[PDB]
């Protein structure tokens, strides 16, 4: 009954750069040496929603970002991994990962999930059928060792078909033109 | 519709010191000093799912801890703060905050929010009226830097109707009798 505008309007959600919507909510008071040695928060965290209309760019981080379910459909994850690095918590980038982040954990969702720092990936959300009926995915990230937009690096079509091509189904339809 | 067992089965679910029910499910590869110069990894995160039967007794962190709403009912947390520690994310504890952590945000409920490390808290979930309904709540919670048990501090009524007084309904309600 709940629809993406009623969550835009009430979580006071603005356009991400990126892709989607988000809101800032809490960031740590402490600090705290990242895996590149700079200086960040302890954790980040925000409100992301995704629609159909409205997806995450592919885009990869240097700390980990973890998931969470709160409303709506189900948000699809694309995850290539650097390496097989989910064990954690030799060629890179060969493995891909779907990940449906839901509440449906008997379909294979999950309810948490974390992208392991060092991983190309981005978020979407189907338009019909079973995993797409409300219109929207509404969760929570907590980006730790904290979130930086320096850190933050976006991608283009051509830029990683040159490096993954083997990939080039998920890079044509999740980079930038 | 889902009920505590339900979830405590497939999710593996087992009993927590605290109270309620929980496991562990990523740990960050990236270690931090903490607010007391202890080396911890950067988060800790974990399923937490709470009962009219079994509550989350007063506990004590030294980090963070944002509690994330998946299902259920809303869980109530019952926050003593250090000191009104809630903006930066002289004598102590006196600020005592009823928070709901739920889905139903026109009701006052937050689906995300964050324990300040120092603050005594703990969490419970309503028998009857419109917030138990369901028997159960379900939550993610993240701790950063990250979940230690050498960090991990328990009261007693006794103990704290010794320090604190002026929370006595909060104390006899919520702590280890």
Chains 1, 2 share one sequence.
Not at 78 to 91: N, T, Y
Not at 119 to 140: H, T
């Amino acid at each position: 009954q709940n629809t993406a505008e009623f969550w835009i309007k009430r979580l006071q959600l603005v356009p991400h750069p990126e892709g989607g919507y988000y809101s800032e909510v809490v960031r740590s008071a402490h600090k705290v040496d990242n895996e590149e040695g700079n200086r960040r928060h302890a954790y980040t965290t925000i409100y992301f929603l995704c629609t159909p209309e409205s997806p995450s760019h592919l885009h990869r981080l240097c700390s980990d970002e973890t998931w969470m379910y709160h409303a709506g459909d189900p948000l699809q994850l694309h995850v290539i991994l650097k390496d097989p690095q989910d064990e954690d918590r030799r060629p890179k980038y060969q493995v891909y990962r779907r990940v449906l982040v839901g509440a449906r954990v008997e379909r294979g969702e999950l309810l948490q999930y974390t992208v392991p720092g060092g991983a190309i990936f981005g978020s979407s959300v189907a338009a019909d059928g079973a995993d797409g009926q409300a219109g929207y995915s509404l969760v929570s990230c907590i980006v730790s060792p904290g979130f930086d937009y320096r850190d933050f690096e976006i991608f283009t079509q051509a830029q990683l078909m040159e490096l993954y091509p083997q990939h080039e189904a998920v890079i044509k339809q999740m980079a930038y033109e």
